[PDB]
Amino acid sequence: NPTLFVSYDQNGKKLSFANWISVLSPQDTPFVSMTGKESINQTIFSWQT
């Protein structure tokens, strides 16, 4: 029941909900982008040198 209307005496204060969320975590992954993928069928693979 404020006599002098101000912002600090209002029982309302309907908050302003922004329509976005900020994120900066990058996912460049330069190595994984240049390696190449080869499908296998065993948990262990071997090669000779």
Binding site: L4, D9, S22, V23, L24, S25
Partner: protein, 298 residues
Amino acid sequence: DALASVDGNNAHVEGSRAEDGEMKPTVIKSNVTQILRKVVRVSDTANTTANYGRGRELMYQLEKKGKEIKRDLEKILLSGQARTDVLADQYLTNSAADPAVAGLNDTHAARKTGAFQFLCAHGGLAGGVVDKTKNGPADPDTGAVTVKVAQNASNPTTNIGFDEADIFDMTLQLYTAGSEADIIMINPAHAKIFAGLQENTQGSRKRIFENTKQFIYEVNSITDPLGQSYKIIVNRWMPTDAVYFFRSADWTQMVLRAPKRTELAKDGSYEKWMIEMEVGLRHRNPYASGVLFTAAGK
């Protein structure tokens, strides 16, 4: 919000059950607005005359004030005030109200917005302004520090500037966090630094001239070792104690009450007017822009 830094070396067995992960919530930011005002008062007599190089004393004085308010705005948004306000921990106000300061009146203090420095990764405060003698914290996920106190160890104590190498250190911090800053706003008094990249103790991209009739001595574009191309901009209303690394899209001006016409009472040969507008400032992420303070050398 930001992803988790639990990357580590997660290794799981083949025949186990899904164990509960590590979930972290978001983080809410909040900034208050500030009230700008410019008053006008001119006696009816002076407003009735016809000046020798203009019209009425009212509109002319109003236009002069309508421009000063914009200058005051540009200087405040770029200031380092600490968002002076009386409220505290009352933004998620859903379970109850705040009657602590409800039995008050215009005696309330003056509200202030969170300027460029306060919205960034500030390390501390100085009562009402951000403290430049403290190095800001680091992001939880990344390890970037967008608030770095220049060392200036390269340059002597005679000239102050901020540094020549500390400019490249911020680009590293921004890239480390993932920011897309591409602008470097600077005070005109410090432009001699970005142009005067010399005085590096005989090294580091010093200088040369091919005896030409053109002398420029200016640096507008910059590229860092990582590839981030930056463009230097000068702002007359910027302070001379810090440099800003930011992006236009990562900032917005929150306007609540726009400037409008306000005719007030007279009380006798006063013809009083007033200008007023409430505006705030926003920042998508404190770690999306850099602030390079200035300090002496060795």
